Chains A and B, each alone.
Chain A
Amino acid sequence: LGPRTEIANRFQSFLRTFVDERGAYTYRDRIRRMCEQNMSSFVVSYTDLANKEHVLAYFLPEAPFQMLEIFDKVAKDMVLSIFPTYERVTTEIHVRISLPLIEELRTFRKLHLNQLVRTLGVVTATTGVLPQLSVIKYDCVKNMEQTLYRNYQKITLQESPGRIPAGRIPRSKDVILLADLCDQCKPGDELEVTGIYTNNYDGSLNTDQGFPVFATVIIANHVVVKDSKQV
């Protein structure tokens, strides 16, 4: 896609050229800060993003995931180009967003699928933290070993018991987290999330009973803790 040409330029012209707030922009330093803490969660703020170029809100939603590819390739190509020193260890990347507009539960519907989202929740019971599979390999005769992994934990959120619509039922939704954004969920807290809406890969697609069994699922690019009860 020849379009893919210009986007990374608009990143590459943006992560190591921009200055805001009277110099030494974070992007010069956050990466290395991340690199010094081995973190892989370098953050963007959409407000600064629109301060430079708000065009990244309107070619995004035809597939924001390819946008995130077009983010991570740039980041990678900055780190190991500038920290080829880094070229040993983990050597993979993704970024974060914090469109800092609060929007609410019980509104995502027919027209909120797989698109630019921003939502909260409140946390309750879920499972441990466990792994998955990642890659396309299994064959040689004419594989279930040496096949890279990625951790996993299930969520469960809940909604504000303060801003309730007066005897409307407290509700519930099934949502996901992933390896790097994991081991921070616990019962009884809230967490503000970038958020993104879809369904299962295939949630029971067939002639069936008098109603399909369909679910709806979300994950976070960014999570920013709202509670933070220590320093």
Chain B
Amino acid sequence: LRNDFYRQLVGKRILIVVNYDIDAICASRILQALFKYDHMLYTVVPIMGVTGLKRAYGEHQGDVKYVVLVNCGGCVDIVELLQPSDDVTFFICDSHRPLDVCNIYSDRQVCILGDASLEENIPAFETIFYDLKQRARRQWESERDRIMFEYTQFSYYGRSAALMVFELAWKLSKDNMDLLWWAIVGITEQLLLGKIESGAYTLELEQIQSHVSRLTNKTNDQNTMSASKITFENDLHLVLYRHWPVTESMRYSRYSSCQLKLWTLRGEKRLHELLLEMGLPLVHARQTYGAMDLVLRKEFFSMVERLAEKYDIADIVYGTFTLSYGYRSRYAAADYVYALLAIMESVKKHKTPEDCFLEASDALSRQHKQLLSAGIDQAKLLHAAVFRQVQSSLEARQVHSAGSFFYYVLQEEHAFFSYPYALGLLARFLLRGHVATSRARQASDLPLIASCPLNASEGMCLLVGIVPVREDSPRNFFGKAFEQAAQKSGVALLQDFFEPAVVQLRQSDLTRFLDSLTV
């Protein structure tokens, strides 16, 4: 509840828009507007790491007390870090979810937007910030069965960033259909069960539906061009259906690749033998869907929904949205998020990251739409430069087992991969390839680790983490796992990024780090 707090927001302020995410601009551009709505001038932040926290804020030692927190909170007993707080209020809407109870109380300088049916963490203040010696430790450890089961076993993230702001705002006589699209941006940002879980997706089939299947404020005369409100249909999050031909999906898609084995040949013969059953032509299977003839393009999903029932891929039907403005197009919300990462370009100007952040935040406007096309372009070639290591690897087998996980190392960087999060993708593309498919799953379901050649930043062995698949919701030990060798030895380690699952070693102090970390 901020119906009482929001109305305090008239004085000076800052709108931090926190460390790297799509969630940021989605849940802020709304309010970079709303500030001039209340006749408030706005002020924003490029953040890349907790690095950025006080090298930016320390430049601003004031008392501007209407303050944001997103994507952080798993940081410090935040007065102990943000000590220049005397009564300076903060406002949190963070997704960096599992927070310590040091940070809520002293309940002047924070606001608790936390309410859940999980009441399991109460005496942590009655244990840590309160703690004869023997029994104190008896409590300490026998309840750290639960407490250290928090914050020393795994980590995860929660819910939206401005769906709260939607919940505030649909009451305030605001129906920014565009901003509902922005909400969907934030949805498939990380609520995609392909990335991080919803589960209740199947019951948000009602939620925003009931928001807008309610609402057609022009229920009788809605046949105009601009800003026609959006419409629900059961659709895909297969890779980039729209502007490239079917065969590009049928190649560059994982949920084929995990179930159909496409990088090899029998994938292709088998594919053809299904395009028989669809009876689509081959030219027509190699022109952009928007480019093809029509009745095939029209009748596509009508057949594909049903007579894909039988062929090892059960989970291609999803629930999604898609729209245009006028007559140039029909965009799709899922045909955007893979464009989003395209300006996340890690060039060696020092200008690129922040100014590309400004560019992206300039992007989600209807007025600013030219540039997005170039992003789509880049994404396609990225998706096909994936292969630039896949078959060379999965057939050469760079794979390392290395005990009770699987082990990978790349040893040469890509300008493609200076931007880091490729390191998550290729893992999630290829463990399928051999380590899942040429075997039973018994050697398949373990997570994986991925070196990161830093050919540009002097050599620092960047990393990200991975789960086993088909049991995803069981949170990542990697939230902790890599503290192991850090805790056993510790070796030039940083946790400079917002995220737990991210680290930075030295170029050549990584193997003994492993042999420590093997366990």
From residue A211, how far is it (CB to closest CB) to chain B in Å?
52
Which B residues are CB-close (under 8 A) to A89?
Answer: 279, 281
Interface check A149, CB cutoff 8 A: no
Interface string of A73-104 (1 = CB under 8 A from B): 00000000001111111000000000000000
Contact B276 A83 (CB under 8 A): yes
Contact A86 B272 (CB under 8 A): no
Interface string of A156-199 (1 = CB under 8 A from B): 00000000000000000000000000000000000000000000
Which A residues are CB-close (under 8 A) to B278?
Answer: 85
Complex Cα–Cα for A141 and B157 (A): 78
- Pick the contact of A32 from B276, B282, B296 — CB < 8 Å? B276
Which B residues are CB-close (under 8 A) to A35?
Answer: 276
| Residues in B274-301 with C-beta less than 8 Å from chain A | 275-279, 281-282, 296
**How many pairs of residues, A versus B, come closer than 8 Å at their CB atoms?**
26
From residue A32, how far is it (CB to closest CB) to chain B in Å?
6
Q: Closest residue to B284 on the A side, CB-wise? A: A89
Interface check B305, CB cutoff 8 A: no
Complex Cα–Cα for A89 and B276 (A): 12
Q: Closest residue to B271 on the A side, CB-wise? A: A36
Contact A36 B273 (CB under 8 A): yes
Which B residues are CB-close (under 8 A) to A47?
Answer: none
Given A32-B273, A36-B272, A36-B273, the answer on whether A86 and B281 have CB atoms closer than 8 Å is no
Which B residues are CB-close (under 8 A) to A36?
Answer: 269, 272-273, 275-276
Complex Cα–Cα for A37 and B278 (A): 14
In this complex, the interface size class of chain A, counting residues with CB under 8 Å from chain B, is 10 to 19
From residue B283, how far is it (CB to closest CB) to chain A in Å?
9
Question: Which of B269, B273, B276, B281 has the most chain A CB atoms closer than 10 A to its own CB?
Answer: B276
Complex Cα–Cα for A87 and B296 (A): 12
Q: Closest residue to B274 on the A side, CB-wise? A: A36
Complex Cα–Cα for A86 and B275 (A): 10
Q: Closest residue to A32 on the B side, CB-wise? A: B276
Interface check A38, CB cutoff 8 A: yes
Q: Closest residue to B303 on the A side, CB-wise? A: A85
Complex Cα–Cα for A37 and B276 (A): 9
Tell me the dominant secondary structure on chain A's binding face: helix
Tell me the dominant secondary structure on chain B's binding face: helix
| Residues in A4-38 with C-beta less than 8 Å from chain B | 32, 35-38
Complex Cα–Cα for A38 and B269 (A): 13
Which A residues are CB-close (under 8 A) to B281?
Answer: 38, 88-89
Contact B279 A88 (CB under 8 A): yes
Given A32-B273, A36-B272, A36-B273, the answer on whether A86 and B282 have CB atoms closer than 8 Å is no
Complex Cα–Cα for A209 and B296 (A): 62
Q: Closest residue to A88 on the B side, CB-wise? A: B279
From residue A229, how far is it (CB to closest CB) to chain B in Å?
25
Interface string of A58-86 (1 = CB under 8 A from B): 00000000000000000000000001111
From residue A92, how far is it (CB to closest CB) to chain B in Å?
14
Complex Cα–Cα for A123 and B342 (A): 56
Contact B277 A38 (CB under 8 A): no
Which A residues are CB-close (under 8 A) to B279?
Answer: 83-89
Q: Closest residue to B295 on the A side, CB-wise? A: A88
| Residues in B238-292 with C-beta less than 8 Å from chain A | 269, 272-273, 275-279, 281-282
Which A residues are CB-close (under 8 A) to B275?
Answer: 36
Which A residues are CB-close (under 8 A) to B272?
Answer: 36-37
Which B residues are CB-close (under 8 A) to A85?
Answer: 276-279
From residue B218, how far is it (CB to closest CB) to chain A in Å?
39
Question: Which of A36, A38, A83 has the most chain B CB atoms closer than 10 A to its own CB?
Answer: A36
Contact A38 B282 (CB under 8 A): yes
Interface string of A95-117 (1 = CB under 8 A from B): 00000000000000000000000
From residue B304, how far is it (CB to closest CB) to chain A in Å?
13
Question: Which of A85, A86, A87 has the most chain B CB atoms closer than 10 A to its own CB?
Answer: A85
From residue B25, how far is it (CB to closest CB) to chain A in Å?
45
Complex Cα–Cα for A37 and B281 (A): 9
From residue B257, how far is it (CB to closest CB) to chain A in Å?
21
Complex Cα–Cα for A52 and B164 (A): 77
Complex Cα–Cα for A58 and B122 (A): 97
Interface string of A119-158 (1 = CB under 8 A from B): 0000000000000000000000000000000000000000
Complex Cα–Cα for A84 and B278 (A): 10
Q: Closest residue to B272 on the A side, CB-wise? A: A36
Which A residues are CB-close (under 8 A) to B269?
Answer: 36
Which B residues are CB-close (under 8 A) to A38?
Answer: 281-282
Complex Cα–Cα for A89 and B281 (A): 7
Complex Cα–Cα for A83 and B273 (A): 12
Which B residues are CB-close (under 8 A) to A87?
Answer: 279
Complex Cα–Cα for A88 and B295 (A): 10
Which B residues are CB-close (under 8 A) to A32?
Answer: 273, 276
Complex Cα–Cα for A49 and B493 (A): 77
From residue B246, how far is it (CB to closest CB) to chain A in Å?
15
From residue A25, how far is it (CB to closest CB) to chain B in Å?
17
The interface of chain A, by Cβ under 8 A from chain B, is: 32, 35-38, 83-89
List, sorted by A's number, 14 A–B pairs whose CB atoms are closer than 8 Å: A32-B273, A32-B276, A35-B276, A36-B273, A37-B272, A83-B279, A84-B279, A85-B277, A85-B279, A86-B276, A87-B279, A88-B279, A88-B281, A88-B296
The 8 closest A-B pairs by CB, nearest first: A85-B279, A36-B272, A86-B279, A89-B281, A36-B276, A35-B276, A36-B273, A32-B276
Name 18 extra pairs, CB < 8 A, besides A36-B269, A84-B279, A88-B281: A32-B273, A35-B276, A36-B272, A36-B273, A36-B275, A37-B272, A38-B281, A38-B282, A83-B276, A85-B276, A85-B278, A85-B279, A86-B279, A87-B279, A88-B279, A88-B296, A89-B279, A89-B281
